[PDB]
């Protein structure tokens, strides 16, 4: 019947827990579509994935594909406004993003469910009639350049491009995909290329319906969704473009048995081992590559990491298959190196080949395959409901690899055991097909090459035949054994019935001097999972720099100790997070509830009776020191945020103070610290999930009793439960703190306009104002003025206080950046004065939907509750309360708020700026003094420059703490 | 562990 539809797939296989409706189909023009109906979703979503990416970039214009991606958002013939798309999403509680990989360009958005069509319509035009406006092209070229600039000093990106540069230079795999001003503007200009036309050509050439996949999720019925999608996408032209292919591997003969010595930016020590392998994608029903990754990358008893770590050569390891593109893949085994490890690379690699030999000797094991198959089946059946935005994006991408009916199960459900495929891949992991790369500062000055796109310094040597020979003769090592049955595999999935006394929010069911227990039995997701969150309060975790280092070292030593045993629980879907905080310790255990008690008990017991291995202590301490120093390699904007934090918090140890005190922590010192840290404590926890009240009280008491029995822990005094305060800036004050980033050649800045203490009133004024300026901020500071790639605005919340912050990373100096933000602020004042009452009411509605958007899974709902507990505000009904209040604000209230707290002449303006200067910038003024279509920046007062943080805080008062919310019950 | 780069439009 319907000529617009080539076919409607059969029933889409889903989990019996998934209440969403599904319908797959293929349009006449060849677009693969997956429709999703969720009548309860608050936000609708859509995504389109074109099966063409940077790998198809024309040789003479590197990055064109990524630039085409950016440009599609800047206007279409049907919707000309450069920001019609983003503005429409913003006003309807939506958002959007897009990415470019070697073979894909994925576009997606989410929006209030009531505006799916308006959003989908504007979105569809991207693939029908983009304008590629000449003025937008000239401006947007800077965003792309800015994007590359932040990556230039990033070790991961440098290594990513270096591998590409080190393969066959004729293979498209060697292309630079990001692109920058040089490749997108300069170069083409000095070669008479009209990028506008090149974008038009590329778009007209590859954006063919036959290479597109779409996924839409909304409240509408499947029939309504179908007509909707047929109506907006059946008009995309099918140009029958052949799907790009790359059968010849980028690493050929001359590229194997090669060794690379690389100089990193951060002080890191890594060893990368790569093997070229065939494309294994078509074998998704068996996944031979993952089978070997599961074994080679295994942690736990008898594993490769175990021996490497015992020999004190390695700390972490990653093994498995790495994607390439249609036609080729790689198999990697990457390890980090200890100092000793750096000097034993040859032995480390032999151990790898010894372990691989064991795999060949034992042969493929079906029980291992069965185990993963069972685990994956359980994971699929009980998979958490995804957020619409990420879900549609993911489906659109994988619709290109699997039949419509299997698009949900293909990546989870295993079906075939393939000892033949497994052996075939194992036969590619041999010394004569290996590539080895070492990353270490020790290579500084010894390199003879440079990677052109990032400037990476390295040396390339052939591996001597004898070394290859020694590896080829690897024999069985008695230390290497295959894993044993995974005893953490869950088997009990019953959902306890909802107790009669069940509450909508966490209830306080234990309030003792030793512990405060918040509890809630899951009443909406119904999966066999639970979240056990614990907060251990102790003044000694952050009393001084030395103890902060010990709190950290201790927990890091503990996790390194439990790793081998915890890995099994990990594969079985039971993980935990343990870290030190400025108030003590944080422990989180989540996953299938079945075996959580066992993992938890083990952690606490281990914690309270810990024995530190001296060798592990020196190694982890050396890494921690390196980690503290490496902060200098972080980006300018991250430095700005770090500084503001140190500046506004009553107590905070800098990274310089931490490493200085690090030489003082000795094994003896750490051993004394632990028992002292555990002697006096207070525990506040939230147990949320598939568990009863008595199981919860039981778990809480088991934790206390373990600590009491092994560490003689006693309660902490209530007045000892202290929370840090935020510095109170003076009315009409403006302070500036300036610093320099010595790695990145970009400037960073954070502007913080402190308002007042948090409260229903203060909160909504600030949030409404942020909702109204959000998209305009991006459109003004980035799209129009192109200050940088990183342009951010939003509320800042800390220690119960709040305010508006702006964060920008750019080539332009901080004082200039400041001027533009002040100019923008004026533009927003006028703008708000000029907007209609309905437009105002529209933003209120948008904010409301964002705040009332319901969590789709247990961990997300838990997180919201945990946030109320940690902040000690315990306002569980905050969203309904704050929204009800938000719907009462008038345009006048926001104008008053701005004129009183934000305007340059506001009586209560509390401003602080953090200026981070670029590497190649000696000095720079703190304040500075035409009309190139740029708004007029107001004149600024003279700022008081901060020389010493400690003095700065001493001469200022401290805000009080926010009062709790009354949540009564025994 | 077992193995499991794109550029974006937006920070």
**A178 contacts in chain B (CB < 8 Å):** 7
Inter-chain contact A70–B9, Cβ cutoff 8 Å? Answer: yes
Cα–Cα distances in angstroms (integers) from residue A926 to residues A147, A282, A818, A952, in the given order: 26, 59, 9, 17
Q: Are A580 and A548 in contact (CB under 8 A)?
A: yes
Q: Are A277 and A330 in contact (CB under 8 A)?
A: yes
Domain map (residue ranges) of chain A: 1-243, 244-473, 500-726, 727-970
Q: CATH second-level architecture of A1-243?
A: 2-Layer Sandwich (3.30)
- B1 → closest Cβ in A157, A318, A789: A318
Bridge partners of residue A107, in order along the sequence: A48, A98
Inter-chain contact B10–A97, Cβ cutoff 8 Å? Answer: yes
Q: Would you state the torsion angle of the CA atoms of residues A287, A289, A294, A297, taken in this order, to the nearest 10 degrees? A: -160
- Cβ count within 10 A of residue A340: 13
Going by C-alpha positions, the residue among A349, A354, A313 that lies closest to residue A474 is A354
Q: What are phi and psi of A283, to 5 degrees?
A: -95, 30
- B8 → closest Cβ in A97, A294, A318: A97
* For testing contact with chain A, the best of B4, B8, B11 (most A CBs within 10 A): B11
| Chain B residue at shortest CA distance from A298 | B1
Please calculate the CA angle A415-A421-A426 and round it to the nearest 5 degrees: 130
Please give the structure tokens belonging to residue A127. Answer: 């693939």
Q: How far apart are CA A238 and CA A211, in angstroms?
A: 9
Q: What element of type H or E holds A840?
A: helix A837-852
Concatenated DSSP letters of A148-159: HHHHHT-HHHHH
Inter-chain contact A317–B6, Cβ cutoff 8 Å? Answer: no
**To the nearest whole angstrom, how far is the Cα of B4 from the nearest Cα of chain A?**
8
A134-152 vs A195-206: helix axis angle to the nearest 10? Answer: 80
Q: Quick check: do A244-473 and A727-970 share a fold? A: yes
Q: How far apart are CA A105 and CA B7, in angstroms?
A: 10
Inter-chain contact B4–A320, Cβ cutoff 8 Å? Answer: yes
**How many Å separate Cα A581 from the centre of its chain?**
21
Please give the structure tokens belonging to residue A12. Answer: 């889409």
Inter-chain contact B1–A319, Cβ cutoff 8 Å? Answer: yes
Please give the structure tokens belonging to residue A857. Answer: 């899974």
Method: X-ray
Inter-chain contact A99–B4, Cβ cutoff 8 Å? Answer: no
CATH fold, domain A727-970, is Cytochrome Bc1 Complex; Chain A, domain 1 (3.30.830)
**To the nearest whole angstrom, how far is the Cα of A299 from the nearest Cα of chain B?**
7
- Cβ count within 10 A of residue A9: 18
Please calculate the CA angle A530-A534-A537 and round it to the nearest 5 degrees: 175
**B9 contacts in chain A (CB < 8 Å):** 69-70, 73, 97-99
Inter-chain contact A293–B3, Cβ cutoff 8 Å? Answer: yes
**A790 contacts in chain B (CB < 8 Å):** 11
Q: What are phi and psi of A803, to 5 degrees?
A: 180, 180
Going by C-alpha positions, the residue among A628, A775, A627 that lies closest to residue A85 is A775
Q: Are A730 and A624 in contact (CB under 8 A)?
A: no
**B3 contacts in chain A (CB < 8 Å):** 290, 293, 297, 318-322, 332
Q: How far apart are CA B5 and CA A410, in angstroms?
A: 23
Q: Which residues contact A596 (CB under 8 A, 6 or more apart)?
A: A530, A532, A574, A589, A699
- Cβ count within 10 A of residue A634: 18
Q: Which residues have a C–N gap over 2.5 Å right after them in chain B?
A: 4
Q: Are A761 and A881 in contact (CB under 8 A)?
A: no
Q: Which residues contact A37 (CB under 8 A, 6 or more apart)?
A: A20, A21, A22, A23, A217, A218, A219, A220, A221, A222, A225
Q: How far apart are CA A929 and CA A462, in angstroms?
A: 58
Q: Are A293 and B3 in contact (CB under 8 A)?
A: yes
Please give the structure tokens belonging to residue A942. Answer: 């003279």
Inter-chain contact B6–A293, Cβ cutoff 8 Å? Answer: no
Inter-chain contact A791–B11, Cβ cutoff 8 Å? Answer: yes
Inter-chain contact A97–B5, Cβ cutoff 8 Å? Answer: no
Tell me the H-state helices in A630-753.
Answer: 636-648, 655-662, 667-679, 693-711
Please give the structure tokens belonging to residue A891. Answer: 């345009």
Q: Which residues contact A295 (CB under 8 A, 6 or more apart)?
A: A359, A368, A482, A483
Q: What element of type H or E holds A450?
A: strand A449-450
**B8 contacts in chain A (CB < 8 Å):** 97-99, 147
**B1 contacts in chain A (CB < 8 Å):** 297, 299, 317-319, 567
Going by C-alpha positions, the residue among A384, A321, A310 that lies closest to residue A348 is A310
A760-778 vs A878-886: helix axis angle to the nearest 10? Answer: 70
Q: How far apart are CA A512 and CA A354, in angstroms?
A: 55
Tell me the H-state helices in A46-168.
Answer: 64-71, 84-90, 116-124, 134-152, 155-165
**A101 contacts in chain B (CB < 8 Å):** 5-6
Length of chain A: 970
Residue identified by tokens 């052939």 is A462
* Numbered residues of chain A with Cβ closer than 8 Å to any chain B Cβ: 66, 69-70, 73, 97-101, 147, 156-157, 160, 177-178, 290, 293-294, 297-299, 317-322, 332, 567, 789-792
A667-679 vs A614-629: helix axis angle to the nearest 10? Answer: 90
Please give the structure tokens belonging to residue A866. Answer: 């945990």
Q: What element of type H or E holds A465?
A: helix A465-472
Sign of CA dihedral A924, A929, A930, A931: positive
Please give the structure tokens belonging to residue A181. Answer: 């001003």
Q: Which residues contact A144 (CB under 8 A, 6 or more apart)?
A: A63, A66, A67, A70, A178, A179, A180, A181, A184, A789
Q: Which residues contact A349 (CB under 8 A, 6 or more apart)?
A: A271, A273, A434, A436, A471
Phi-psi region of A671 (alpha: psi -120 to 50; beta: other; left: phi over 0): alpha
Going by C-alpha positions, the residue among A197, A178, A157, A142 that lies closest to residue A62 is A178
Q: What element of type H or E holds A766?
A: helix A760-778
Length of chain B: 11
Inter-chain contact A299–B3, Cβ cutoff 8 Å? Answer: no
Cα–Cα distances in angstroms (integers) from residue A538 to residues A620, A681, A968, in the given order: 23, 6, 25
Q: How far apart are CA A918 and CA A747, in angstroms?
A: 5
| Chain A residue at shortest CA distance from B8 | A99
Classify domain A500-726 at the CATH class level: alpha beta
Q: How far apart are CA A288 and CA A38, in angstroms?
A: 36
Q: CATH second-level architecture of A244-473?
A: 2-Layer Sandwich (3.30)
Bridge partners of residue A576, in order along the sequence: A589
Give the number of C-alpha atoms closer than 13 A to the C-alpha of residue A332, restricted to the C-beta side.
18
Concatenated DSSP letters of A157-176: HHHHHHHHHTS-TTSGGG--
Q: What are phi and psi of A25, to 5 degrees?
A: -170, 165
């Amino acid at each position: 019947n319907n000529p617009a539809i080539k076919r409607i797939g059969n029933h889409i296989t889903k989990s019996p827990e998934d209440k969403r409706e599904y319908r797959g189909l293929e349009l006449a023009n060849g677009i693969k579509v997956l429709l999703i109906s969720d009548p309860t979703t608050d936000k609708s979503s859509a995504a389109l994935d074109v099966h063409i990416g940077s790998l198809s970039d024309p040789p003479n214009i590197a990055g064109l594909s990524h630039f085409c991606q950016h440009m599609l958002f800047l206007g279409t013939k049907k919707y000309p406004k450069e920001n019609e798309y983003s503005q429409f999403l913003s006003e309807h509680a939506g958002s959007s993003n897009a990415f470019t990989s070697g073979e894909h360009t994925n576009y997606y958005f989410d929006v209030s469910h009531e505006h799916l069509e308006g959003a989908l319509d504007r979105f569809a035009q991207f693939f029908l009639c983009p304008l590629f406006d000449e003025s937008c092209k000239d401006r947007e070229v800077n965003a792309v350049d800015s994007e590359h600039e932040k990556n230039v000093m990033n070790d991961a990106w440098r290594l990513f491009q270096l591998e590409k540069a080190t393969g066959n230079p004729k293979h498209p795999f060697s292309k630079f995909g990001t692109g920058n001003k040089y490749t997108l503007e300069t170069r083409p200009n000095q070669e008479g290329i009209d990028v506008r036309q090149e974008l038009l050509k590329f778009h007209s050439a590859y954006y063919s319906s036959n290479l597109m996949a779409v996924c839409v999720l909304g409240r509408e019925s499947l029939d309504d969704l179908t007509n909707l999608v047929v109506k907006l996408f059946s008009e995309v032209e099918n140009k029958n473009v052949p799907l790009p292919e790359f059968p010849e591997h980028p690493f050929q003969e001359e590229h194997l048995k090669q060794l690379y010595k690389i100089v990193p930016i951060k002080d890191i020590r890594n060893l990368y081992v790569t093997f070229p392998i065939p494309d294994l994608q078509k074998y998704y029903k068996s996944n031979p590559g993952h089978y070997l990754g599961h074994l080679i990358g295994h942690e736990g008893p008898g594993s490769l990491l175990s021996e490497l770590k015992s020999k004190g050569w390695v700390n972490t390891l990653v093994g498995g298959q790495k994607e390439g593109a249609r036609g080729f893949m790689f198999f990697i085994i990457n390890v980090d190196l200890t100092e000793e490890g750096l000097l034993h690379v040859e032995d480390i690699i032999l151990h790898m080949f010894q372990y691989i030999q064991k795999l060949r000797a034992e042969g493929p094991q079906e029980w291992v395959f069965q185990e993963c198959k069972d685990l994956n089946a359980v994971a699929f059946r009980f998979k958490d409901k995804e957020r619409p935005r990420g879900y549609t994006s993911k489906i659109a991408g994988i619709l290109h690899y699997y039949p419509l009916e299997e698009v949900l199960t293909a990546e989870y459900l295993l079906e075939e055991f393939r000892p033949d495929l497994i052996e075939m891949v194992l036969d590619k992991l041999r010394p004569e097909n290996v590539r080895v790369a070492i990353v270490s500062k020790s290579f500084e000055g010894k390199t003879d090459r440079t990677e052109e796109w990032y400037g990476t310094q390295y040396k390339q040597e052939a591996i001597p035949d004898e070394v290859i020979k020694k590896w080829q003769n690897a024999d069985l090592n008695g230390k290497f054994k295959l894993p044993t049955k995974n005893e953490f595999i869950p088997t009990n999935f019953e959902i306890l019935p909802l107790e009669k006394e069940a509450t909508p929010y966490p209830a306080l069911i234990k309030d003792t001097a030793m512990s405060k227990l918040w509890f809630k039995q899951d009443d909406k997701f119904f999966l066999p999972k639970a979240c056990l969150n614990f907060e251990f309060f102790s003044p000694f975790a952050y009393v001084d720099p030395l103890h902060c280092n010990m709190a950290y070292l201790y927990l890091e030593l503990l996790k390194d100790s439990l790793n081998e045993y915890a890995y099994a629980a990990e594969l079985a879907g039971l993980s935990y997070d343990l870290q030190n905080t400025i108030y003590g310790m944080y422990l989180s255990v989540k996953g299938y509830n079945d075996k959580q008690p066992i993992l938890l008990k083990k952690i606490i017991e281990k914690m309270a009776t810990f024995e530190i291995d001296e060798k592990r202590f020196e190694i982890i301490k050396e890494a921690y020191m390196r980690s503290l120093n490496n902060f200098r390699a972080e980006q300018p904007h991250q430095h700005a945020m770090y500084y503001l934090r140190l500046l506004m918090t009553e107590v905070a140890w800098t990274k310089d103070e931490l490493k200085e005190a690090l030489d003082d922590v000795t094994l003896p010192r750490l051993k004394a610290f632990i028992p002292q840290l555990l002697s006096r404590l207070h525990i506040e926890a939230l147990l949320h999930g598939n568990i009863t009240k008595q199981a919860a009280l039981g778990i809480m008491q088991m934790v206390e009793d373990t600590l009491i029995e092994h560490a003689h822990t006693k309660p902490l005094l209530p007045s000892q439960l202290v929370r840090y305060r935020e510095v109170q800036l003076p009315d009409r004050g403006w302070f500036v703190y300036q610093q320099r980033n010595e790695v990145h050649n970009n400037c960073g800045i954070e502007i913080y306009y402190q308002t007042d203490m948090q409260s229903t009133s203060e909160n909504m004024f600030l949030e409404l104002f942020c909702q109204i300026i959000s998209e305009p901020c991006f459109n003004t500071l980035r799209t129009k003025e192109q200050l940088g790639y990183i342009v951010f605005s939003g509320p800042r919340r800390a220690n119960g206080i709040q305010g508006l912050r702006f964060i920008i990373q750019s080539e332009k100096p901080p004082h200039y950046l400041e001027s533009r933000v002040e100019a923008f602020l004026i533009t927003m004042e006028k703008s708000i004065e000029d907007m209609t009452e309905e437009a105002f009411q529209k933003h209120i509605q948008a904010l409301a939907i964002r705040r009332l958007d319901k969590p789709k899974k247990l961990s997300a709902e838990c997180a919201k509750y945990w946030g109320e507990i940690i902040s000690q505000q315990y306002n569980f009904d905050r969203d309904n309360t704050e929204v009800a209040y938000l719907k009462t604000l008038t345009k006048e209230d926001i104008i008053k708020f701005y004129k009183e707290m934000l305007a340059v002449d506001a009586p209560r303006r509390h401003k602080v700026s953090v200026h981070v200067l670029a590497r190649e910038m000696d000095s720079c003024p703190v304040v500075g003094e035409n009309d190139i279509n740029l708004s007029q920046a107001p004149a600024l007062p003279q700022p008081e420059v901060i020389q010493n943080m400690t003095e700065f805080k001493r001469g200022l008062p401290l805000f009080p703490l926010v009062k709790p919310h009354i949540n009564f019950m025994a | 562990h077992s193995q499991g780069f794109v550029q974006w439009l937006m920070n």
